[PDB]
C-alpha cells in the first residue's frame, strides 16, 4: 500500500516500462498517426465489500494445474502424512489378471498377481485409489541400502495410518510387488504420478485431495492464511544424488526423477524406488544407470525405470537433511525446496 | 532503416532493423596551368630600385 | 489464439446440425492460419490413402480443438500454440475407452468404424482420442493380426482398459486399408535379424567388446544364431551397405509407430475419470 | 518468464576487436550446447574449448556423444555486452515461438521434425572464430530427420570398415557428400556396443515365424511393384532366401496363454525404431511457418514450435 523503498515496493507490486510503454501509446497523443507536416459488523462486512471492491479494483504470480480426486484411505493417508509429500496414481487393477496372463514370461506363475491383489483388498477392508510415497518406502523397505531409516519409514507408518492392521496393509502389499515383478508387469506399468499433496478433505473411508498436476509449489494458498506454505519431503531411504557420487558440484537448476530398479529372480526379487536429483539431460540418464546398479543387471528386459518428476529452477540447489515429527516419531527425512512440478511418461525395458 | 509490414495470425518472426552504412570518400584533383613572362611583371609590380 | 474455418454456403437443416454435434472434436489443418476453407479439413484433402497415409498425414498436419461452433464459421484452438495460451479446453470423447485423469492421450486414424455433409458433398472422418498405452497397443494388435492372413489366436481380438471390454473384430476392407503396414513391419524385422546374423559371426571382433557380446550370447544371442543358422545358410556381399539402408528404414518405422501424446488431462472440480462421449478438460502446458 | 523464457545469459568479456564483435552479430540463428542451466555464463563454456577433453578434441562422430549430455539452446539476440539463449528443453520464449538459421545445404518443410548434427558436409565445416580471444564456435547444422537418421548411419558404418563410396549422399535431386574422416576407434566402441544390445535384445521366439514368410516375399515381389520397389535391388532378404530355407518350430513353452507375434512387435519396436533416437540425439524441433511458405530454403531463418 505504497510504502517508500519504491522502486522495490513497486517491483513487487506484479512497472515503470509500463507506464513508459503506455506513456508514447496512450498518454501521448492525438497521434497515433494524424494530419501532415450494526455496531461491530457494517463496517466490517461493509468494507469486506469494499475489500471485495479492492479485489476488483485491482486484479510475478505463477500459474498451476490444480486437481481433485475423491480417494479411498486405504493404501494412502493424507491425514497422517502432512501436506506436501509425493503422491502416486494407479490404473485400475481389473486390467491386472489379463495383462499378467500374457506379459509373464512362460514358465511362471500368471495365477500370482490376482491371487496376491486380491488379498490386499480383503486386508485393508478389516476403486482406482493412491499410493502415498512414504507408504511406498516400508512396502520395498526390504531391498534397501539403509535399511534402518526403511525401519524409521515402517516405525511412523503402522501407528499414524488410519485403518487396522497396517503392517498387515505393508507386508501384503509389498507380497503384490513381488507378484508385480514376477509375473512381469512391471510397477512402473502401474504407478502413475499424480501430484504433490496441498490439502484434503475428511471423511469416512474416502478422502478428497487436492493437489497441483503441473507448477510450482510453495504459492498456493494452502488454505491457512497464516502459512500458505508447505514444503516437499522425502524419506532418506529414496534420495540419491548424482551430483556428488559422478562429481558434478557445478550450480545449476537440478531435476527430480524417479526410478525403480528391477531385480528378476526365483521368489527373490526386489523393488527400490528412488528420488534421483539430477543436472542431467533426461537422454543423458541412461547411461549413468549403467554404472551404478549393474548389479541387479546379472541377477535377472532392463533393471531401470524412470520418468520426471519435477524440476529446481534454484541455480545453486538447496537441499535439507532433517529429522522431522510424524506424529511422535523421528524419520530421517530429505526435504526439498523450490520445487516445480512437470510430469513425464516411463521408460521401457522389454 | 528497414522497412516492416505488418501481418496477422500467429506471429512466427519479426524485429525492426537498422544499418549503418559508410562509404569511403575518394579524393582527386584539378590541375590548371598558368604563366608569366618577366615583361609584365614590372608592370604589375611597381617601380623599380 | 483461436483459428477460423469458413462453411461455405449452401448448408441444408441436417449438414448444419450434424455440424452442432461434433462440438469438442479434433481437426488436423495444414498451417496455422487465420482464415480457412472446410474443404481443407475433409477426407478429399487426404486423397483414398491408408493407415500408413493418414500417420504420416497426421504427423505433418496441425490438429486443433474445435471449440464453440458459429453457424457461418469453424472456430478451431491449435493444440500447438493456443493451448499454451489459453488455461484449458474441452474436448469430447469420440472413443469407447473411458478417459481417466492424468492420462496422455494421442489419437489414432478411424481404423475402428464418420460425419458426411451432403450439401457440401463431403466427408468427414475424424481421429479417436483414445490413451497412449492403449494407443501402442491397439496398432500393433492390428499389424499381428494382418500377418496371419499371409500365410490367428481366439484371444488378441479382445482388450481391456479400466474395467471395459473392446473387441477388435466387432474386416476385410480394414486388412487390405492395413496390407502396407504389414508389407514394412515385416521387412525390416526379416533384414534386421539377417543383419545381426551375418555379423556376429563375421567379425566377432576381438578384446573385451566381443567378450562381453558373447557374454551376452551364452546360450541367448549364439543359441538364438544357432537355431536360426540351422534352417539357414552361414563374391560380396554389401554388409555394411545394407545398414545404412536399413537404419534408414527401420528408423523410420519408429516415428511412424511412435504416437505422441498431445493431451493430457488435469481435471479439476470434475470426475477423474471421464466416460465416453463426455466432454474432459484438457491441457498441453504445465 | 522463468517456466515461459529462460534468459540463460552468455556474457561478452571486455577485450573483442570491433571486427570480431560484429562477427557476432551473424549469430542469429545457432545452436549453442550449455553444460547447465545456470542464469550467467561465459563464451569459455560455450566455445570448443570447453568440449575438449584432456588433450583431446573428439572426431565428428564422438561430437555427437557429449551434445547429448548437454542441452541445446538457440541465441535470441545478440547484445554488445552479453547473447541470451533459451534452452529448448525448459521453455521457449512468451508465445513458444522461437527462430532458427539454416545453416544447412538442405531446405526445410513444414511439420518435419529437425535434428541438429555436428558440420560433418563438406565446404560446409565453418567455425566462427574469435581471433581476439582464441575461441572457435562449431555450429552444428540443423537437418531434417530422413537425412540425419542416414548421415549418421554412413559414419556408423564407416568406422566399422577401419575395423577389417560410402561418404556420398543424395536428398530430392541434390547429390551431396560429407567429408571422409579417420575416426577415434574410443568413439566407434560405444557406437558398435550400441547398436548389438539394441539388435540382440530385438529379437524373440515369435521373430521365427516371420522368418518362415520370407520366401514368400520373393513369391510376392514377382507381382506386387510395391513390393519389388520396397526391399532393394541390393537388399539382403533377397540374397538370404536363396541360401536360407527358414521354418518354425512345431510347439511353444506355454504357448496356450502367450502371444507370438504381438510380442515379436513391442520388443522390436523398444530396440530397434527405438535404435535411431539413442544414436543421434532427439529432433526436439519442428517448424510451422505461420504464414510464409511451405518450404524453408537455406540461409533463411525458419519459426520452431516444440516437438513432443
Redesign the interface.
Known amino acids: 500500500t505504497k510504502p517508500l523503498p519504491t522502486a522495490p515496493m513497486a517491483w513487487a507490486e506484479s512497472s515503470p516500462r509500463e507506464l513508459a510503454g503506455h506513456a508514447p501509446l496512450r498518454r501521448v497523443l492525438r497521434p497515433p498517426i494524424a494530419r501532415r507536416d450494526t455496531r461491530a459488523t457494517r463496517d466490517d462486512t461493509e468494507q469486506a465489500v469494499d475489500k471485495i471492491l479492492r479485489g476488483a479494483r485491482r486484479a510475478g504470480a505463477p500459474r498451476y494445474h490444480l486437481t481433485r480426486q475423491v480417494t479411498l484411505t486405504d493404501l494412502c493417508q493424507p491425514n497422517a502424512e502432512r501436506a506436501g509429500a509425493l503422491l502416486l496414481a494407479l490404473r485400475h487393477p481389473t486390467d491386472l489378471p489379463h495383462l499378467a496372463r500374457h506379459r509373464a514370461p512362460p514358465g511362471r506363475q500368471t495365477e500370482r498377481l490376482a491371487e496376491a491383489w486380491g488379498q490386499l483388498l480383503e486386508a485393508s477392508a478389516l476403486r482406482a485409489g493412491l499410493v502415498s510415497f512414504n507408504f511406498l518406502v516400508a512396502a520395498c523397505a526390504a531391498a534397501y541400502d539403509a535399511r534402518d531409516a526403511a525401519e524409521a519409514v515402517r516405525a511412523h507408518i503402522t501407528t499414524n495410518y488410519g485403518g487396522t492392521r497396517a503392517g498387515a496393509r505393508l507386508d501384503r502389499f509389498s507380497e503384490c510387488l513381488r507378484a508385480m515383478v514376477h509375473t512381469h508387469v512391471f510397477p512402473h506399468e502401474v504407478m502413475r504420478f499424480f501430484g504433490g499433496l496441498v490439502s484434503w478433505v475428511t471423511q469416512d473411508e474416502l478422502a478428497s485431495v487436492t493437489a497441483v498436476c503441473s507448477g510450482p509449489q510453495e504459492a498456493t494458498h494452502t488454505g491457512h492464511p497464516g502459512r500458505p506454505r508447505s514444503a516437499v519431503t522425502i524419506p532418506a531411504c529414496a534420495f540419491v544424488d548424482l551430483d556428488a557420487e559422478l562429481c558434478l558440484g557445478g550450480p545449476g537448476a537440478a531435476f527430480l526423477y524417479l526410478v525403480f530398479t528391477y531385480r528378476q529372480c526365483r521368489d527373490q526379487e526386489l523393488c527400490c524406488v528412488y528420488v534421483v536429483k539430477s543436472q542431467l539431460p533426461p537422454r543423458g540418464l541412461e547411461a549413468a544407470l549403467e554404472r551404478l546398479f549393474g548389479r541387479l543387471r546379472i541377477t535377472n528386459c532392463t533393471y531401470a525405470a524412470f520418468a520426471e518428476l519435477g524440476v529446481m529452477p534454484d541455480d545453486s540447489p538447496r537441499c535439507l537433511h532433517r529429522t522431522e515429527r510424524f506424529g511422535a516419531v523421528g524419520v530421517p527425512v530429505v526435504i526439498l525446496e523450490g520445487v516445480v512440478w512437470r510430469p513425464g511418461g516411463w521408460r521401457a525395458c522389454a | 532503416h528497414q522497412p516492416l509490414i505488418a501481418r496477422d495470425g500467429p506471429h512466427p518472426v519479426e524485429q525492426p532493423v537498422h544499418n549503418y552504412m559508410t562509404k569511403v570518400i575518394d579524393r582527386r584533383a584539378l590541375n590548371a596551368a598558368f604563366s608569366l613572362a618577366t615583361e609584365a611583371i614590372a608592370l604589375l609590380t611597381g617601380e623599380a630600385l | 489464439?483461436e483459428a477460423d474455418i469458413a462453411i461455405p454456403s449452401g448448408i441444408s437443416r441436417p449438414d448444419a446440425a450434424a455440424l452442432q454435434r461434433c462440438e469438442g472434436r479434433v481437426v488436423f489443418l495444414?498451417?496455422?492460419?487465420?482464415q480457412l476453407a472446410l474443404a481443407d479439413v475433409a477426407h478429399e484433402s487426404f486423397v483414398s490413402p491408408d493407415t500408413l497415409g493418414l500417420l504420416l498425414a497426421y504427423?505433418?498436419?496441425?490438429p486443433a480443438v474445435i471449440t464453440r461452433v458459429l453457424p457461418t464459421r469453424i472456430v478451431a484452438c491449435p493444440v500447438?500454440?493456443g493451448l499454451?495460451?489459453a488455461?484449458?479446453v474441452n474436448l469430447r470423447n469420440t472413443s469407447p475407452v473411458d478417459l481417466?485423469?492424468?492420462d496422455?492421450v494421442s489419437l489414432v486414424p478411424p481404423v475402428f468404424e464418420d460425419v458426411r455433409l451432403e450439401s457440401l458433398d463431403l466427408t468427414l472422418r475424424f481421429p479417436v482420442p483414445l490413451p497412449?498405452?492403449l494407443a501402442?497397443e491397439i496398432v500393433?494388435?492390428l499389424?499381428?493380426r494382418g500377418?496371419?492372413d499371409?500365410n490367428e489366436?481366439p484371444?488378441?481380438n479382445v482388450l481391456?482398459?479400466?474395467?471395459a471390454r473392446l473387441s477388435l473384430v466387432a474386416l476385410a476392407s480394414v486388412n487390405t486399408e492395413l496390407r502396407?503396414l504389414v508389407?514394412?513391419?515385416?521387412?525390416?524385422?526379416?533384414?534386421?535379424?539377417?543383419?545381426?546374423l551375418?555379423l556376429?559371426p563375421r567379425?566377432l571382433?576381438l578384446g573385451y567388446?566381443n567378450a562381453?557380446?558373447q557374454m551376452?550370447?551364452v546360450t541367448?544371442?549364439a543359441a538364438?544364431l544357432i537355431?536360426?543358422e540351422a534352417?539357414?545358410?552361414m563374391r560380396r556381399?554389401?554388409?555394411?551397405?545394407?545398414?545404412?539402408?536399413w537404419?534408414?528404414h527401420?528408423?523410420?518405422?519408429?516415428?511412424i509407430?511412435?504416437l505422441?501424446?498431445?493431451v493430457r488431462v488435469?481435471?479439476?472440480?470434475?470426475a477423474?475419470?471421464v466416460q465416453s462421449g463426455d466432454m474432459a478438460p484438457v491441457?498441453r502446458?504445465?
Open positions: 489464439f495444414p498451417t496455422i492460419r487465420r504427423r505433418r498436419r496441425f500447438d500454440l499454451t495460451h488455461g484449458t481417466c485423469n492424468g496422455p497412449t498405452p501402442r500393433a494388435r499389424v499381428a500377418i496371419r499371409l489366436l484371444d488378441l481391456y482398459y479400466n474395467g502396407s508389407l514394412n513391419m515385416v521387412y525390416s524385422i526379416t533384414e534386421g535379424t539377417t543383419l545381426i551375418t556376429i567379425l571382433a567388446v562381453l557380446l551376452q550370447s541367448r544371442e538364438q537355431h536360426p534352417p539357414m545358410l556381399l554389401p554388409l555394411y551397405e545394407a545398414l545404412v539402408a537404419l534408414a527401420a528408423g523410420q518405422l519408429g516415428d509407430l511412435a505422441a501424446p498431445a488435469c481435471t479439476f472440480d470434475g477423474a475419470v491441457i502446458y504445465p
